[PDB]
Design an enzyme around this catalytic site. Structure first.
Site, PDB file in Angstrom:
ATOM      1  N   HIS C  43       0.832  -1.222   0.000  1.00  0.00           N
ATOM      2  CA  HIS C  43       0.000   0.000   0.000  1.00  0.00           C
ATOM      3  C   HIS C  43       0.854   1.255   0.000  1.00  0.00           C
ATOM      4  O   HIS C  43       0.318   2.350  -0.302  1.00  0.00           O
ATOM      5  CB  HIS C  43      -1.148   0.029   1.039  1.00  0.00           C
ATOM      6  CG  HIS C  43      -0.809   0.384   2.453  1.00  0.00           C
ATOM      7  ND1 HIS C  43      -0.784  -0.503   3.491  1.00  0.00           N
ATOM      8  CD2 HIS C  43      -0.496   1.568   3.026  1.00  0.00           C
ATOM      9  CE1 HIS C  43      -0.386   0.120   4.608  1.00  0.00           C
ATOM     10  NE2 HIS C  43      -0.237   1.380   4.352  1.00  0.00           N
ATOM     11  N   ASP C  99      -0.699  -7.303   2.036  1.00  0.00           N
ATOM     12  CA  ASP C  99      -0.028  -6.007   2.000  1.00  0.00           C
ATOM     13  C   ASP C  99       1.460  -6.201   2.316  1.00  0.00           C
ATOM     14  O   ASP C  99       1.884  -5.844   3.444  1.00  0.00           O
ATOM     15  CB  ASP C  99      -0.726  -5.097   2.994  1.00  0.00           C
ATOM     16  CG  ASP C  99      -0.403  -3.623   2.948  1.00  0.00           C
ATOM     17  OD1 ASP C  99      -0.182  -3.061   1.865  1.00  0.00           O
ATOM     18  OD2 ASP C  99      -0.442  -3.015   4.053  1.00  0.00           O
ATOM     19  N   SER C 201       2.897   3.661   8.249  1.00  0.00           N
ATOM     20  CA  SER C 201       2.594   2.448   7.478  1.00  0.00           C
ATOM     21  C   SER C 201       3.871   1.836   6.897  1.00  0.00           C
ATOM     22  O   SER C 201       4.819   2.552   6.522  1.00  0.00           O
ATOM     23  CB  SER C 201       1.598   2.681   6.334  1.00  0.00           C
ATOM     24  OG  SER C 201       0.596   3.627   6.558  1.00  0.00           O
TER      25      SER C 201
HETATM   26  C1  LIG Z   1      -3.087   3.542   1.021  1.00  0.00           C
HETATM   27  C2  LIG Z   1      -4.154   3.228   2.109  1.00  0.00           C
HETATM   28  C3  LIG Z   1      -3.692   2.891   3.352  1.00  0.00           C
HETATM   29  C4  LIG Z   1      -4.647   2.957   4.557  1.00  0.00           C
HETATM   30  C5  LIG Z   1      -4.475   4.214   5.270  1.00  0.00           C
HETATM   31  O1  LIG Z   1      -4.691   5.280   4.685  1.00  0.00           O
HETATM   32  N1  LIG Z   1      -4.186   4.142   6.581  1.00  0.00           N
HETATM   33  C6  LIG Z   1      -4.192   5.248   7.149  1.00  0.00           C
HETATM   34  C7  LIG Z   1      -5.207   4.970   8.298  1.00  0.00           C
HETATM   35  C8  LIG Z   1      -4.686   4.258   9.593  1.00  0.00           C
HETATM   36  C9  LIG Z   1      -3.419   3.341   9.323  1.00  0.00           C
HETATM   37  C10 LIG Z   1      -2.991   2.758  10.575  1.00  0.00           C
HETATM   38  C11 LIG Z   1      -3.031   3.306  11.835  1.00  0.00           C
HETATM   39  N2  LIG Z   1      -2.532   2.393  12.700  1.00  0.00           N
HETATM   40  C12 LIG Z   1      -2.178   1.286  12.043  1.00  0.00           C
HETATM   41  N3  LIG Z   1      -1.659   0.197  12.583  1.00  0.00           N
HETATM   42  N4  LIG Z   1      -2.450   1.483  10.736  1.00  0.00           N
HETATM   43  C13 LIG Z   1      -2.304   4.174   8.729  1.00  0.00           C
HETATM   44  C14 LIG Z   1      -2.735   5.422   7.781  1.00  0.00           C
HETATM   45  N5  LIG Z   1      -5.948   2.663   4.133  1.00  0.00           N
HETATM   46  C15 LIG Z   1      -7.025   2.534   4.995  1.00  0.00           C
HETATM   47  O2  LIG Z   1      -6.976   2.205   6.196  1.00  0.00           O
HETATM   48  N6  LIG Z   1      -8.163   2.722   4.241  1.00  0.00           N
HETATM   49  C16 LIG Z   1      -9.762   2.691   4.879  1.00  0.00           C
HETATM   50  C17 LIG Z   1     -10.026   1.289   5.323  1.00  0.00           C
HETATM   51  C18 LIG Z   1     -11.446   1.207   5.908  1.00  0.00           C
HETATM   52  C19 LIG Z   1     -12.782   1.388   5.140  1.00  0.00           C
HETATM   53  C20 LIG Z   1     -14.146   1.254   5.781  1.00  0.00           C
HETATM   54  C21 LIG Z   1     -14.286   0.919   7.169  1.00  0.00           C
HETATM   55  C22 LIG Z   1     -13.060   0.756   7.935  1.00  0.00           C
HETATM   56  C23 LIG Z   1     -11.589   0.891   7.321  1.00  0.00           C
HETATM   57  C24 LIG Z   1      -9.733   0.288   4.203  1.00  0.00           C
HETATM   58  C25 LIG Z   1      -8.809  -0.767   4.502  1.00  0.00           C
HETATM   59  C26 LIG Z   1      -8.456  -1.739   3.462  1.00  0.00           C
HETATM   60  C27 LIG Z   1      -9.007  -1.693   2.082  1.00  0.00           C
HETATM   61  C28 LIG Z   1      -9.946  -0.624   1.748  1.00  0.00           C
HETATM   62  C29 LIG Z   1     -10.306   0.360   2.802  1.00  0.00           C
HETATM   63  C30 LIG Z   1      -7.855   3.091   2.935  1.00  0.00           C
HETATM   64  O3  LIG Z   1      -8.709   3.346   2.039  1.00  0.00           O
HETATM   65  N7  LIG Z   1      -6.462   3.007   2.838  1.00  0.00           N
HETATM   66  C31 LIG Z   1      -5.648   3.307   1.740  1.00  0.00           C
END
Ligand SMILES: CC1=C[C@@H](C(=O)N[C@H]2CC[C@H](c3cnc(N)[nH]3)CC2)n2c(=O)n(CC(c3ccccc3)c3ccccc3)c(=O)n2C1
Lengths: 10, 27, 254
Positions: C43, C99, C201
């Site tokens: 990711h 991932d 991340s």
């Molecule tokens: C590049 C991406 C990485 C990451 C991110 O940005 N993550 C962000 C959010 C917290 C994370 C994080 C915090 N603490 C840990 N251990 N990880 C680090 C930074 N990610 C998400 O969590 N979702 C949202 C999530 C979700 C949707 C609906 C309901 C609950 C969670 C999601 C996870 C996996 C596939 C699609 C969406 C999304 O669309 N992405 C894209």
């Protein structure tokens, strides 16, 4: 906020 | 090997400030 | 890191900062698994929905850093990539399943008191350490808070986190959790917080083998719902679960 890194890396 | 043995700690026989916590958790 | 503290100099010799050439910016964390390979989450590299698809030439891997911003010369080493390998079955479409991603260094990186690799877990260690209640440690230069009202930290940050039970993880969220994920953090009941945040991340989730004194990377920081939210847990690539893979490319490609 980042300090510039030596150019040969770029 | 040497993987994971940190030269500033595990190597001079020093512990980092929060590692205790961990070891304790593997209770 | 939310609720962490300033790490100690030399505390995480495997800590890799995945850097972006234009714009010059923090992109993610990563870890040094050998003199040639860095370990990261897919990711940080490929997220179609975000128009995120970085190539071998977009990134710069800086190892041995401590300071977030300063070019720490003669101490840190900026390296160039040979190739990026993303788990063929990584699932960005649905649950960010698998991932994982291997990055190959253009040249071997010289170990110093600041540069040292972590180990990968074996069956027995993975076995005896990957258990609920058991605290791992996360490090990164990510955000102090989920959103900051009033890319944040001065130096590498630290936070030690409890491994949580599956069913707890599964209750936490609406996402299809898999065998290849694991969650951590304090229950809203334990009056104790912290978590990995944005910019954290792909960095390492490591724990110490009370058997050999070696530090082992058990997980890569993955997805979560915001940072440090009551009742939700931080998600993690199950590094030992994907070992058959690591092992494989590492020897396909040296
Ligand atoms: C590049 C991406 C990485 C990451 C991110 O940005 N993550 C962000 C959010 C917290 C994370 C994080 C915090 N603490 C840990 N251990 N990880 C680090 C930074 N990610 C998400 O969590 N979702 C949202 C999530 C979700 C949707 C609906 C309901 C609950 C969670 C999601 C996870 C996996 C596939 C699609 C969406 C999304 O669309 N992405 C894209």
């Amino acid at each position: 906020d980042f300090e510039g890194i030596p150019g040969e890396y770029l | 090997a040497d993987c994971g043995l940190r030269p500033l700690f595990e190597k001079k026989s020093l512990e980092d400030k929060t590692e205790r916590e961990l070891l304790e958790s593997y209770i | 890191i939310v609720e962490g503290s300033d790490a100690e100099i030399g505390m995480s010799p495997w800590q890799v900062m995945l850097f972006r050439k234009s714009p010059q910016e923090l992109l993610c964390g990563a870890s040094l698994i050998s003199d040639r390979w860095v370990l990261t989450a897919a990711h940080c590299l490929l997220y179609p929905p975000w128009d995120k698809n970085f190539t071998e030439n977009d990134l710069l891997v800086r190892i041995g850093k401590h300071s977030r911003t300063r070019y720490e010369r003669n101490i840190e080493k900026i390296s160039m990539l040979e190739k990026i390998y993303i788990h063929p079955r990584y699932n960005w479409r649905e649950n960010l399943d698998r991932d994982i991603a291997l990055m190959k260094l253009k040249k071997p990186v010289a170990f110093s008191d600041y540069i040292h690799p972590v180990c990968l877990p074996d069956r027995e260690t993975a076995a005896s350490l990957l258990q609920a209640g058991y605290k791992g440690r996360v490090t990164g230069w990510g955000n102090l808070k989920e959103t900051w009202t009033a890319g944040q930290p001065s130096v590498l940050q630290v936070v030690n986190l409890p491994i949580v039970e599956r069913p707890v993880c599964k209750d936490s969220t609406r996402i299809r959790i898999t065998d290849n994920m694991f969650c951590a953090g304090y229950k809203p009941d334990e009056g104790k917080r912290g978590d990995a945040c944005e910019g954290d991340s792909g960095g390492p989730f490591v724990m110490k083998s009370p058997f050999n004194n070696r530090w082992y990377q058990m997980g890569i920081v993955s997805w979560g719902e915001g940072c440090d939210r009551d009742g939700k847990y931080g998600f993690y690539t199950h590094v030992f679960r994907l070992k058959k893979w690591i092992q494989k490319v590492i020897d396909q490609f040296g």
